[PDB]
């Protein structure tokens, strides 16, 4: 139909995050059979192949930002590919990798629909700046490049010349934040970004939280929704095989729930599954739980609802 029409983009890129090993992100999610587990319900699945990530050998660092140009080239390439698959009328399933790719994943999505919304389900806001981080790791600076209210204040870090900030600060909702460095929360409070952290998640209940999140984004006007989803935003009892595990995340139930509310609007238009890392599970059973989690999250995004999915013929026959 309109929804569950999928363009898969595997993006094995790592240089935004330091723990090398997330480049077996799309490989493990595909060998866990995400394609065929879509194909039971009416999923128009078209794999577009993995993106080539060239290696700039002299990707010389910035002041704090390190590996900048590889990240910027990867996200520009992904912005072109996301714009391609959104001109294909599909829902962009862009899975990596790391949050560095979400720059172009939101950018190329805005190249077709400039008035979308971002549900950034993550343990962290990932809105550090190149100037006021202390890491310089670009797996936590995608959102700072994308907000128009931050323009004139973001440095011209190389690789990011193509970057146009494309989303508004009032057009993004964080859900499941649980570890924020101080620069990101000043940005969070000064821009007036609406957010439901694990405080507000527990306060309203996850259902009233998704109710008010859809009342904030879609309560004004129907518009495309871009669920960009980290897998450390869930609790590390379910996904310990991630890059930055922080205890106290969402239960696996509620992660599936957030995806199902985004489905039952019928307005899912872009999906990111980042920070999957099979190299950091202490046992392969940890990796198995993590990858089965992220697969079933992606299933419940496109309408593998826990209520049921059907084909409209009589089955008493």
């Amino acid at each position, epitope marked *: 139909a309109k929804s569950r029409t999928i363009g898969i983009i595997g993006a094995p890129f790592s240089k935004g995050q330091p723990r090398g090993g997330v480049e077996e992100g799309p490989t493990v999610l*595909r*060998k*866990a*059979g995400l*394609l*065929e*587990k879509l194909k039971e319900q009416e999923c128009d699945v078209k794999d577009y192949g993995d993106l080539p990530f060239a290696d700039i050998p002299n990707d010389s660092p910035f002041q704090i930002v390190k590996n900048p140009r590889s990240v910027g080239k990867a996200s520009e390439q992904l912005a072109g590919k996301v714009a391609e698959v959104k001109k294909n009328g599909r829902i962009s399933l862009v899975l990596g990798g790391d949050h560095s790719l979400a720059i172009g994943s939101i950018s190329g999505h805005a190249r077709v629909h400039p008035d979308l919304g971002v549900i950034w389900v993550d343990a962290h806001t990932d809105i550090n700046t190149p100037l006021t981080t202390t890491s310089g790791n670009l797996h936590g600076q995608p959102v700072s490049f994308l907000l128009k209210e931050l323009k004139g204040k973001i440095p011209d870090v190389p690789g990011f010349s193509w970057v146009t900030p494309c989303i508004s600060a009032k057009d993004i909702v964080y859900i499941g934040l649980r570890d924020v460095d101080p620069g990101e929360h000043y940005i969070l409070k000064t821009l007036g970004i609406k957010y439901f952290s694990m405080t507000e998640v527990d306060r309203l209940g996850i259902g009233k939280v998704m109710e008010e999140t859809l009342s904030y984004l879609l309560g004004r006007k129907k518009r495309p929704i871009h669920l960009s989803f980290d897998v450390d935003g869930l609790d590390p009892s379910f996904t310990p095989a991630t890059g930055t595990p922080v205890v106290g995340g969402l239960t696996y139930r509620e992660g599936l729930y957030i995806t199902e509310e985004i489905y039952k609007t019928g307005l899912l238009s872009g999906l990111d599954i980042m920070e999957v890392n099979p190299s950091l599970g202490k046992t*392969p*059973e940890e990796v*198995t739980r993590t*990858v*089965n989690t992220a*697969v079933a999250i992606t299933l419940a995004c496109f309408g593998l609802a826990r209520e049921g999915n059907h084909k409209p013929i009589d089955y008493l026959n």
Partner: antibody, heavy 125, light 108 residues
Framework: QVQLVQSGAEVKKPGASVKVSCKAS????????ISWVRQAPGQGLEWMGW????????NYAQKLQGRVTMTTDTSTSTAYMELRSLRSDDTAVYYC??????????????????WGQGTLVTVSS | EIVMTQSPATLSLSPGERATLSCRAS??????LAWYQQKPGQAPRLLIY???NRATGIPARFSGSGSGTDFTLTISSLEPEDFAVYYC?????????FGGGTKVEIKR
């Protein structure tokens, strides 16, 4: 017809494992489930782990929990089995066969009907 | 670890009559086990699927029974291509043990 083309006969010291390729065909995959069984020569046989190809259900055996890993590759109907902390008791022919997926959409099956041709693995240094 | 015991350890019967074999369980497997045809150095192909009913490429003569402790493998029309080490194997208890060995020789 319904087969399993395995691969392949390989010896390892006590060290790294033998990810045994167990390629399926004929029957529709993820409508069934592939398991594993060791056989030392001149001995009986021990089943050692079964996965459902339906959804990643690991379900290993006793005395190796732990030592075994088993995944799917269900793009191509193959399934795999590695090992860990290998040992000279594992001088065994490794067979894979199809127990049927014990999920919900998967037909009644108890009985191992593809059998693969085997894999000569002797753990000797 | 239910031990499956095959009461004919060896077997040597001419091309000819019935070659009824026995496999016993230490519990009630209850019509949940199979029968195999391990030729030397080959694929131990399935003979009989769920204590009966003769799976999918079986020739004519491989009936068997059970349900539920001590089972039978009948080779009625012996057919001398069938000289192989046979195995019953319980299934519906973990871990899924096997029989011992049923070397069907040639009687001469």
């Amino acid at each position: 017809q319904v087969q399993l083309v395995q691969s392949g006969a390989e010896v390892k010291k006590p060290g790294a494992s033998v990810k045994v390729s167990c390629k399926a065909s004929g029957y529709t995959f993820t409508n069934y489930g592939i398991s594993w069984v060791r056989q030392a020569p001149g001995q009986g046989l021990e089943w050692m782990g079964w996965i459902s190809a339906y959804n990643g259900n690991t379900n290993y055996a006793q005395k190796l929990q732990g030592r075994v890993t088993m995944t799917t590759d269900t793009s191509t109907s193959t399934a795999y089995m590695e090992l860990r902390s290998l040992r000279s008791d594992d001088t065994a022919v490794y067979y894979c066969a199809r127990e049927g997926a014990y999920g919900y959409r998967s037909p009644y099956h108890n009985w191992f009907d593809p059998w693969g041709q085997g894999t000569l693995v002797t753990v000797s240094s | 670890e239910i031990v499956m015991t095959q009461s004919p350890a060896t077997l040597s019967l001419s091309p000819g009559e019935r070659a009824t074999l026995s496999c016993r369980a230490s519990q009630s497997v209850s019509s949940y086990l199979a029968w195999y045809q391990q030729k030397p150095g080959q694929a131990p192909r399935l003979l009989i699927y769920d204590a009966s009913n003769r799976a999918t490429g079986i020739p004519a003569r491989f009936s068997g029974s059970g349900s539920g402790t001590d089972f039978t493998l009948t080779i009625s029309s012996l057919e001398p291509e069938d000289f192989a080490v046979y195995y019953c194997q319980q299934h519906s208890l973990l871990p899924r043990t096997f029989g011992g060995g049923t070397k069907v020789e040639i009687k001469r």
